[PDB]
Amino acid sequence: EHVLTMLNEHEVKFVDLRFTDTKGKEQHVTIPAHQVNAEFFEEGKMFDGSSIGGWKGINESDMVLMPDASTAVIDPFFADSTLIIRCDILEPGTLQGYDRDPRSIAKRAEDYLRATGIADTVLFGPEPEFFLFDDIRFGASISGSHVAIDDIEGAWNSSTKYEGGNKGHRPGVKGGYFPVPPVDSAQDIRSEMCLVMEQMGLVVEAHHHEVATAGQNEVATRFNTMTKKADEIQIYKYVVHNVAHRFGKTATFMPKPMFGDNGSGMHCHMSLAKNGTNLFSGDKYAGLSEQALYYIGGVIKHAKAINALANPTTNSYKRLVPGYEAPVMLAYSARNRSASIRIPVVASPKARRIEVRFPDPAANPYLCFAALLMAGLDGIKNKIHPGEPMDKNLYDLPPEEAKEIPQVAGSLEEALNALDLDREFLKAGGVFTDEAIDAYIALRREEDDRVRMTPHPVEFELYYSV
Amino acid sequence: EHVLTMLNEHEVKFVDLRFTDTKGKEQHVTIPAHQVNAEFFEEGKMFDGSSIGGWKGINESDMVLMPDASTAVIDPFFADSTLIIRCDILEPGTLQGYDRDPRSIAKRAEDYLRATGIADTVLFGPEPEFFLFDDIRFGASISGSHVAIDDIEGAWNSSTKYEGGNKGHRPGVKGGYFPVPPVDSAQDIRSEMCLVMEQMGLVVEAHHHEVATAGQNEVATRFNTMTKKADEIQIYKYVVHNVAHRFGKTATFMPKPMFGDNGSGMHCHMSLAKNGTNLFSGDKYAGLSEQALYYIGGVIKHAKAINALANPTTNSYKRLVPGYEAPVMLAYSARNRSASIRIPVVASPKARRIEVRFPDPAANPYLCFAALLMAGLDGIKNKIHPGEPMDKNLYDLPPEEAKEIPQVAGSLEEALNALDLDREFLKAGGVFTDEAIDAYIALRREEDDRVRMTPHPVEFELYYSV
Amino acid sequence: EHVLTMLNEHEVKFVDLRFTDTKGKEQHVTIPAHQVNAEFFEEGKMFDGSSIGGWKGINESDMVLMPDASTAVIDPFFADSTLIIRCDILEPGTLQGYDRDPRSIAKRAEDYLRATGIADTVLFGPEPEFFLFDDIRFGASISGSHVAIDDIEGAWNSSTKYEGGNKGHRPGVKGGYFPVPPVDSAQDIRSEMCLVMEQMGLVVEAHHHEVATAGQNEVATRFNTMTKKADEIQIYKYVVHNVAHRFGKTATFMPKPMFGDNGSGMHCHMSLAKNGTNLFSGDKYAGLSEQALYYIGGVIKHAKAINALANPTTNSYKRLVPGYEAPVMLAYSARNRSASIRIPVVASPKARRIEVRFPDPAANPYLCFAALLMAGLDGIKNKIHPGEPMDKNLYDLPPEEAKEIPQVAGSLEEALNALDLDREFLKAGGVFTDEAIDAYIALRREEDDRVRMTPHPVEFELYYSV
């Protein structure tokens, strides 16, 4: 009913139905507002399943788009007044919730949480970073391939001739952390993104330029319950992509667009709760509950499999490389930023939580968050102890005992394989089905293949004169 | 009278008289509003027949334009207020309805339906798809020929240098199914098309980007009675073409503009009715009446001849090729999307119908719809049983029994020849005359010849070094 | 031994081993002269079969290259002295003669001729025509396709600006038949081709410019026994291609490179003989033997199947179109140049023969000639009477009885299908195996598909605004 009044209040002409595919990309279809009736909400609208990658095959194409009336929000970019309504994908007749629908999967995972009685709500606070460029060009054909990035902030443009003169105040390599404008050219744009994000229901905590030259930026938003947060991530990306477009830029959430400067990560802060109390505060290490520790143990035990969802691109592994600040060591600490799991030191026990650092923004919200949870729960159910916190150092020196302690997957294939083998913790509660998992893996292997099979420019530098 | 009041209400300065030629192209002529009087409606206006392709020859040029007052609608693009009035082409004196007038032919077919008493109204719900480009160039002369397509969405432009930078968020090949903007660059335009379509009497159900890269799009409209729907198709195309033009684009309803990506089809949903009840619902397969099955049998029996009207271009056959999703297998099913006849699975028996998938948007509304009907009726009158539904697979593997089951025509010539031989079902009720059919065939053979006789670029690749 | 002396006489450094693939394209591999020993001639050299299209598959790759010492001839273009030796492809161990080797097939056919005792030698006098251009450009990708032809003789260049001025004496469209230079710009080149052809063993009868503008030309060579003539065709093409290249031109034997002007044909004059007497001279029509007539009957009966070898490209059918001089009517005559079979009127009965006009230069020598023979023999063995000679007119007016008399295939697919069904006459004597035929058909269907599936530039002209 709230929806039917929003239609009149904003004189809506269209309703934009949205959903996410397996890869994590928001999709949409539009219907005139006059097509929204009572039926619409109880039985949804029909659409072809076979069209989305990794979904229904040759025989069972048709499926249901079920509008979730709680998600109604006005689109701030479209020319004609239109209302966005996120939808779940349900199996026809049964109206159950498609095994391969990432939002259904995430909901199932929140259900299973309540069911085990371990807690009643999961809290996710992801920190996606991104880049804002002016020009992005790439291609690949039989005779070669290339990628060219360009932005007014790129340090390389210190020598570029410009029509009205080079005004040259640019962030150097790894020198983007906070120079005030004009070095930072994105203040106005970061704020528009903030205002718009809030007009769309998100709550912004801060915004700032990130480390890399050439437009790395970040908008920090307040956490929320798992599934609602993944929804927020989708909106977040949408706002970022579109505000950038409107400003004459182009944004990307790729994890490592440039060799030699910062990649973009999506740290995930998590904590559990029951009847308003934070199940993660306690007397153990850094203010943690023993539940938190088991959770951590779970995440560490299933890290490589989580990688397949939290770092789902070959590019993801160009960020997760033996570097200093590389969040690749499977350990926890409240200081050592070598550890992929940081423990925020905060006063109020109400805010005690863990920060899993290896995820990147390419990750499917839904599936990434879900896999993080399930690993945590399995860590609890099986009281998987974390061991002791690493407070020493990262991957380089150490190099004492060859420092072969836990680490995240080193390639996408490896992560996919881990997901293959270590799938039980995900199938728990019937959240993830084998079919879903196998389909996801197949989609990504096809991507992994393109990169493995196509000659790399660097290979010419290294081997043309062989 | 309603017309004469619309003239005053909108301060109309002109009346744009419209009609369609044999090929399916809407035509027009304009007269000042002050030329609209009582006479106009009862006796129409005179015009030269010999000017339209495939119409009157050397001796009998003059014919009548009969305004159909029910079709009055304001043109939303012209600068000066003008009212559009669709017209039928009548033989002078007799005022009968020209044998070769596609609208008259379609009306005759609706009449014959009522006459046989099989039903009192036919329902058509076509789904024309189309492409929106930025640049289209082509030519052919003695020294060569070419065609060049270009659009900001084309995947090939991932490498193109642009004045203000390449913002690069483009739908990859076969990757247009629903990425939200900015990947989908046509939201605003699809909605203007919707709003305008509705201002012109159409009822829109949905709009979305289609599968192909480079601007394939679709506006779904509500079905209507056969002849009124063909009228709607013409308006639909008009709106699409002109809104595109106003937005700096160029739209085409060609069936296969690009090799390697989706073509554009025009699926046709059909059903019959009498005194408000759906003659297609029943206890037989998937909720069908035995009448529906005979109809299907008719369509299948006369498929190749229908092709000559539903796929009237050589280009049409570049879409209908042994592909996976190619709607080329003459069979029905509620799932197998290899079958050119899908049976929508819907709850309300009031909405039971069949979907003939092989038609393309190049088809003349009128003649295509009519041929579909006549084939259906002949399927009924002669209780032509469908056989059993194909629920196995498409054209490739199968490949067991060489899988030579029914198929649609494989070339325009073949389709024209089928139409030649299998014309009886069309002549039924005096709907289609031999002269009309022979004239249509002659028009298309001339087109078929251009393509058969002109060297193809690929022939050089294949045989220049022979 | 003659070969071993040619090696010393010309101080040969290399031996270029040549052969032809199924499509008809000459192939080669080179070995130092010092690799030529006694063994070489008796056991040949080994090579990978799987590399040539339509040959050995996954398991049986290796085959034998058997040098035919009778074919030794010096290459007139290579920089270092090299001797060309044509080779047959033999099955290893058995040393039989590969079923799919076109030269072996042609030899088998000459054998079968002698075996039936019908005659002891077959005489072939083909007349391949060709084009000489300056620039040829073409391509096809997802966004389009094109072909651009250019030559200093092209009539279209009457308006072109040239660096040193346009000297403008060019052959107009269809106006190339014999204007003396400078209109004819290829006298010097046609003669070099002649001299070189003769240095390579061919005997030249004449050379002249052909009908089409833009460099159509022809070098007429003396007939020879079937297999030796096909060898000559290969050499002929080689000389043409390479002399053109050396003169800064580019030659093509494609049958119809331009719409609107002459295509290139390869008329085939044939006759049979026994113990020096011409089995084709007689008292019947135009000086023919009844044997000749049965031969003609055979050719006419199996025309469509022969087409698959004599007109093996989709392009071939752009030459064979209802035109005036189009050699498409399956009939004979000594005058009517509408007839695909002309009977040369000559005095000496020693020179009596038939001229089958529909072949084009794209045809595989071997397979085309062989198919022509086998059809002729089957015409004899089964005394297939020709019927009466057509002396009336071609395809247009006539148009009396709709003039549906015999005609050659109208498309490649049709020809391939005919070859499929009408294969018996080819399998006779074990000359053609089913496997060979099926493989050939598969190679060409793949080619036919490219053309059928790729949008044609003309389709845009005809249907973009549909």
Q: Which B positions 142-171 lie with beta carbon below 8 A of chain C?
A: 142-150, 154-156
CA–CA min distance B169, chain A (Å)? 8
Q: Which residues are CB-contacts of A462 (< 8 A; sequence separation ≥ 6)?
A: none
> Is A42 an annotated catalytic residue?
no
The beta-carbon neighbor of B180 closest among A27, A80, A250 is A27
Distance CA C150, CA C133 (A): 6
C298 is in an annotated binding site: no
Q: CA–CA separation, B331 vs B393, rounded Å?
A: 11
A26 close to B (CB below 8 A): yes
Taking CB atoms and an 8 Å limit, are B453 and C258 in contact across chains?
no
- Smallest CA-to-CA distance from B456 within B465, B464, B444 is with B464
How far does Cα C228 stand from its chain's mean position?
13
- CA-closest candidate to residue B98, choices B145, B65, B126: B65
Active site residue C42: no
Q: What is the CA radius of gyration of chain C?
A: 23
DSSP of A110-173, one letter per residue? HHHHHHHTS-SEEEEEEEEEEEEESEEEEEEETTEEEEEEE-TT-GGGGG---TT--------T
In 3-state terms, what secondary structure has residue C125? strand
The beta-carbon neighbor of B206 closest among A31, A78, A82 is A31
Q: Is A129 a known active-site residue?
A: yes
The breaks in chain C (C to N more than 2.5 Å) occur after none
Residue A48 appears among annotated catalytic residues: yes
Min Cα separation B147/chain A (Å): 21
Residue of C337, C414, C420, C422 marked active site: C337
Q: Which residues of C touch B257 (CB under 8 A)?
A: 455, 460, 464
Q: Which of C155, C257, C466 lies closest to B313 in CB terms?
A: C466
Say whether C290 counts as a known binding-site residue. Answer: no
User: Is C325 assigned a ligand-binding role in the annotation?
Assistant: yes
What does the block give as tokens for C15?
Answer: 């031996």
In 3-state terms chain C splits into helix, strand, coil percentages (rounded to 5) of 35, 25, 40
Ligand-binding annotation for C262, yes or no, is yes
Contact B161, A137 (CB under 8 A): yes
Could you write out the three-class secondary structure of chain B? CHHHHHHHHCCCCEEEEEEECCCCCEEEEEEEHHHCCHHHHHHCEEEEHHHCCCCCCCCCCEEEEEECHHHCEECCCCCCCEEEEEEEEECCCCCCCCCCCHHHHHHHHHHHHHHHCCCCEEEEEEEEEEEEECEEEEEEECCEEEEEEECCCCHHHHHCCCCCCCCCCCCCCCCCCCECCCCCCCHHHHHHHHHHHHHCCCCEEEEEECCCCCCEEEEEECCEEHHHHHHHHHHHHHHHHHHHHHCCCEEECCCCCCCCCCCCCEEEEEEEEECCEECCECCCHHHECHHHHHHHHHHHHCHHHHHHHHCCCHHHHHCCCCCCCCCCEEEEECCCCCEEEECCCCCCHHHCCEEECCCCCCCCHHHHHHHHHHHHHHHHHCCCCCCCCCCCCCCCCCCCCCCCCCECCCCHHHHHHHHHHCCHHHHHHHCCCHHHHHHHHHHHHHHHHHHHHCCCHHHHHHHCCC
State the residue for tokens 């996606």.
Answer: A128
Reference A380, options A307, A302, A434; nearest CA is A302
Known active-site residue A153: no
Instruction: Kindly list the distances between the CA atom of residue C52 and the CA atoms of B461, C20, C25, C184, in Å, as whole numbers in the listed order.
Output: 18, 10, 11, 40
Per CB-CB distance under 8 Å, the chain B contacts of A58 are 335-338, 393-394
Experimental method: cryo-EM
Tokens of C189: 């080149």
The number of beta carbons lying within 10 Å of the beta carbon of residue A388 is 10
| Active-site position among A21, A26, A355, A448 | A355
Chains contacting A (3 or more CB pairs within 8 Å):
B
Residues 115-134 of A with CB under 8 A from B: 133-134
Chain B residues whose beta carbon lies within 8 Å of the beta carbon of residue C455 = 147, 256-259, 315, 318
Length of chain A: 466
Assigned token pair, A424: 């039980």
Residues at the binding site of B for Mg(2+) are 127, 129, 210, 218, 267, 355
Identify any residues that bridge with B66 across adjacent strands, giving them in sequence order.
B88
Question: Hey, are the CB atoms on C313 and B462 less than 8 Å from each other?
Answer: yes
Tell me which of B91, B99, B127, B448 is the catalytic residue: B127
Flag if C464 and B254 touch (Cβ within 8 Å). yes
- A86 labelled catalytic: no
* SS3 category, C14: strand
Q: ∠ at Cα A461 (A455, A464), nearest 5°?
A: 75
B396 touches chain A (CB under 8 A): no
Rounded-to-integer distance, Cα B294 and Cα B298, Å: 6
Rounded to whole angstroms, the Cα distance separating A449 from A442 reads: 11
CA distances from C386 to C298, C345, C369 (A): 8, 18, 20
Q: Locate B452 and state its tokens.
A: 């058969």
Set of chain B residues whose Cβ sits within 8 Å of the Cβ of A26? 179-180
Tokens standing for C205?
A: 């009868």
Residue found under tokens 């290579």:
C78
Question: Among residues A375, A366, A308, A441, which one has the least CA distance to residue A105?
Answer: A366
How big is the CA angle at C275 (ends C269 and C276), to the nearest 5 degrees? 50
User: Is C453 one of the annotated binding-site residues?
Assistant: no
Q: CA-CA distance, A368 to A311, in Å (whole number)? A: 9
Q: Pairing state of beta strands A82-90 and C135-141?
A: unpaired
Q: Is B207 a catalytic residue?
A: no
Enumerate the known binding-site residues of A for ATP.
205, 269-271, 337, 342, 350
Resolution for this experimental structure (Å): 6.2
DSSP code for C69 = G
